[PDB]
Design an enzyme around this catalytic site. Structure first.
Site, PDB file in Angstrom:
ATOM      1  N   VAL A  21       0.811  -1.220   0.000  1.00  0.00           N
ATOM      2  CA  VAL A  21       0.000   0.000   0.000  1.00  0.00           C
ATOM      3  C   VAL A  21       0.856   1.287   0.000  1.00  0.00           C
ATOM      4  O   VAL A  21       1.766   1.452   0.813  1.00  0.00           O
ATOM      5  CB  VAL A  21      -1.080  -0.036   1.118  1.00  0.00           C
ATOM      6  CG1 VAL A  21      -2.127   1.096   0.933  1.00  0.00           C
ATOM      7  CG2 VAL A  21      -1.772  -1.410   1.138  1.00  0.00           C
ATOM      8  N   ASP A 137     -11.989 -11.750   7.375  1.00  0.00           N
ATOM      9  CA  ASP A 137     -10.651 -11.560   7.946  1.00  0.00           C
ATOM     10  C   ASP A 137     -10.598 -10.284   8.755  1.00  0.00           C
ATOM     11  O   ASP A 137      -9.704  -9.443   8.576  1.00  0.00           O
ATOM     12  CB  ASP A 137      -9.575 -11.498   6.861  1.00  0.00           C
ATOM     13  CG  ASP A 137      -8.175 -11.675   7.423  1.00  0.00           C
ATOM     14  OD1 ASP A 137      -8.038 -12.008   8.623  1.00  0.00           O
ATOM     15  OD2 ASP A 137      -7.199 -11.493   6.674  1.00  0.00           O
TER      16      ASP A 137
HETATM   17  N1  LIG Z   1      -6.459   3.575   2.644  1.00  0.00           N
HETATM   18  C1  LIG Z   1      -5.397   3.382   3.479  1.00  0.00           C
HETATM   19  N2  LIG Z   1      -4.796   4.421   4.149  1.00  0.00           N
HETATM   20  C2  LIG Z   1      -3.760   4.226   4.973  1.00  0.00           C
HETATM   21  N3  LIG Z   1      -3.241   3.001   5.170  1.00  0.00           N
HETATM   22  C3  LIG Z   1      -3.732   1.887   4.585  1.00  0.00           C
HETATM   23  C4  LIG Z   1      -4.858   2.020   3.674  1.00  0.00           C
HETATM   24  N4  LIG Z   1      -5.167   0.786   3.227  1.00  0.00           N
HETATM   25  C5  LIG Z   1      -4.274  -0.087   3.801  1.00  0.00           C
HETATM   26  N5  LIG Z   1      -3.424   0.586   4.624  1.00  0.00           N
HETATM   27  C6  LIG Z   1      -2.316  -0.029   5.399  1.00  0.00           C
HETATM   28  O1  LIG Z   1      -1.789  -1.102   4.609  1.00  0.00           O
HETATM   29  C7  LIG Z   1      -1.960  -2.358   5.287  1.00  0.00           C
HETATM   30  C8  LIG Z   1      -2.344  -3.456   4.314  1.00  0.00           C
HETATM   31  O2  LIG Z   1      -3.559  -3.076   3.668  1.00  0.00           O
HETATM   32  P1  LIG Z   1      -4.646  -4.209   3.309  1.00  0.00           P
HETATM   33  O3  LIG Z   1      -5.680  -3.575   2.420  1.00  0.00           O
HETATM   34  O4  LIG Z   1      -5.113  -4.771   4.636  1.00  0.00           O
HETATM   35  O5  LIG Z   1      -3.769  -5.252   2.442  1.00  0.00           O
HETATM   36  P2  LIG Z   1      -3.715  -6.862   2.573  1.00  0.00           P
HETATM   37  O6  LIG Z   1      -5.015  -7.360   1.981  1.00  0.00           O
HETATM   38  O7  LIG Z   1      -2.515  -7.297   1.759  1.00  0.00           O
HETATM   39  O8  LIG Z   1      -3.484  -7.110   4.056  1.00  0.00           O
HETATM   40  C9  LIG Z   1      -3.054  -2.109   6.332  1.00  0.00           C
HETATM   41  O9  LIG Z   1      -2.879  -3.011   7.412  1.00  0.00           O
HETATM   42  C10 LIG Z   1      -2.823  -0.655   6.709  1.00  0.00           C
HETATM   43  O10 LIG Z   1      -1.777  -0.568   7.685  1.00  0.00           O
END
Ligand SMILES: Nc1ncnc2c1ncn2[C@@H]1O[C@H](COP(=O)(O)OP(=O)(O)O)[C@@H](O)[C@H]1O
Ligand SMILES: [Mg+2]
EC number: 2.7.11.30
Length: 305
Positions: A21, A137
């Protein structure tokens, strides 16, 4: 804008098992950009499709902007999911950095629960039918904190529609947050919809525990402990599915409530009960998300200790 020519990637702000991200800019507007490799195509389609379901815009659901394939300058396939950027990051990261008083912690707990109740609830509105959705999840890393100290649910890479036209291995989430029936391979798929809401509710309980383990008012005259994930002291980092099954399903253990929480008060007693009714061994006895939101609303408003 909404067009990936105008997209600039800045620094990495997080990563999970499906995407990396980055902070970014779409036609001058700050955004966050989740990058999936080719191997993680299915998770991209799933997440985009869940975000595009009618009536998925809500104060406690992360704001999706645009999603599409973008080939790299090297001719490799990538998938990009663009959403609102949340500077506070995940709830996990927020809790690492911050303690909060009673009203603030309840705000975190109440907003996450409101998001989940919204997600869980079928809205039969003809041309705008929203199916019931399970997250699948749910955890601190998949919840983000807004600038107002309320939360949004994110990461729908594994989520599943539970009502509507086109439907359906349970062992797929983050292990430490798996309900006992998931760790037993005992999820009762006869009532798909209820079984899967009940799986989110268990995880919600663990989230509540992590939030209130960081509440200043629950540790009066004493230090608030440094942040730890549910089960972190018991099983460590990255437990195996097997070790988790033993602890959670076989031994029926749960994160412990500190001695500092002396339940000679209605607020604390009802806090503990609400957490315990969420992570109950008996899936069928767990609170619904709607009931849980009301519990948390009432705790947020409790006048005096
Ligand atoms: N829109 C956002 N703004 C800020 N941080 C984000 C955002 N989306 C994800 N993150 C950060 O990135 C990490 C991984 O995002 P996530 O969508 O949960 O990916 P994955 O499905 O690979 O775990 C999250 O745990 C968070 O810390
Ligand atoms: Mg994630």
């Amino acid at each position: 804008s909404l067009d990936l020519d105008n997209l600039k990637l800045l620094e990495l702000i997080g990563r999970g098992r499906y995407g990396a991200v980055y902070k970014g800019s779409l036609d001058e507007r700050p955004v966050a950009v989740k990058v999936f490799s080719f191997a993680n195509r299915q998770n991209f389609i799933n997440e985009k499709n869940i975000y595009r379901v009618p009536l998925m815009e809500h104060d406690n659901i992360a704001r999706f902007i645009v999603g599409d394939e973008r080939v790299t300058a090297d001719g490799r396939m990538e998938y990009l999911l663009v959403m609102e950027y949340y500077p506070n990051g995940s709830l996990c990261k927020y809790l690492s950095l911050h303690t909060s008083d009673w009203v603030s912690s309840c705000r975190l707990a109440h907003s996450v629960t409101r998001g989940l109740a919204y997600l869980h609830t079928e809205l039969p509105r003809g041309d705008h039918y929203k199916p019931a959705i399970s997250h699948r999840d749910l955890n601190s890393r998949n919840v983000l904190v807004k600038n107002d100290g309320t939360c949004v649910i994110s990461d729908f890479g594994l989520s599943m529609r539970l009502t509507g036209n086109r439907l359906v291995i349970s062992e797929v989430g983050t292990i430490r947050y798996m309900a006992p029936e998931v760790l037993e391979g005992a999820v009762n798929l006869r009532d798909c919809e209820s079984a899967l809401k009940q799986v989110d509710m268990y995880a919600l309980g663990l989230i509540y525990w992590e939030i209130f383990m960081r509440c200043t008012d629950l540790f009066p005259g004493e230090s608030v402990p440094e942040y730890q994930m549910a089960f972190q002291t018991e099983v460590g980092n990255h437990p195996t599915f097997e070790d988790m099954q033993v602890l959670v399903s076989r031994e029926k253990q749960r994160p412990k409530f500190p001695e500092a929480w002396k339940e000679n008060s209605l607020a604390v007693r009802s806090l503990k009960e609400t957490i315990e009714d969420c992570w109950d061994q008996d899936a069928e006895a767990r609170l619904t998300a709607q009931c849980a939101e009301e519990r948390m609303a009432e705790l947020m408003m409790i006048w005096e200790r």
